[PDB]
Curated annotation (Swiss-Prot):
Lineage: Viruses, Riboviria, Pararnavirae, Artverviricota, Revtraviricetes
Organism: Equine infectious anemia virus (isolate 1369)
Gene name as annotated: gag
Superkingdom of origin: Viruses
Protein name: Matrix protein p15
Length: 116
């Protein structure tokens, strides 16, 4: 169909987002772990035979449309576990400094519709 000519990226590299990422509190009452992330990334990077987990950086639009199929496969909390991580990582990655995962489900919605 079309092409978004210039969008040049997202707020910051997965790394940066990572750092700030963990700060954002989490579920029960334990913040997020760097690895917690690489986990949900890998969780998909593998499910779709892709390789972001490998890629130095990457834009969500590239991945956000993949999530759906994953969040849709993992049943147990494993699910919320996953999504909630994203809501965040996506939100977070998208310069949306949040003070918690859940808080930023919004941001997701907007990031999905947009890049989905």
């Amino acid at each position: 169909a079309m092409a978004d000519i210039g969008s040049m990226g997202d707020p910051l590299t997965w790394s940066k987002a990572l750092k700030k990422l963990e700060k954002v509190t989490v579920q029960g009452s334990q913040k997020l772990t760097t690895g917690n992330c690489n986990w949900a990334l890998s969780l998909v990077d593998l499910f779709h035979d892709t390789n972001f987990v490998k890629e130095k950086d990457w834009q969500l639009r590239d991945v956000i449309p993949l999530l759906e199929d994953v969040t849709q496969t993992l049943s147990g909390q494993e699910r919320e576990a996953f999504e909630r991580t994203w809501w965040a990582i996506s939100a977070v990655k998208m310069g949306l400094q949040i003070n918690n995962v859940v808080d930023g489900k919004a941001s997701f919605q907007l990031l999905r519709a947009k890049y989905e």
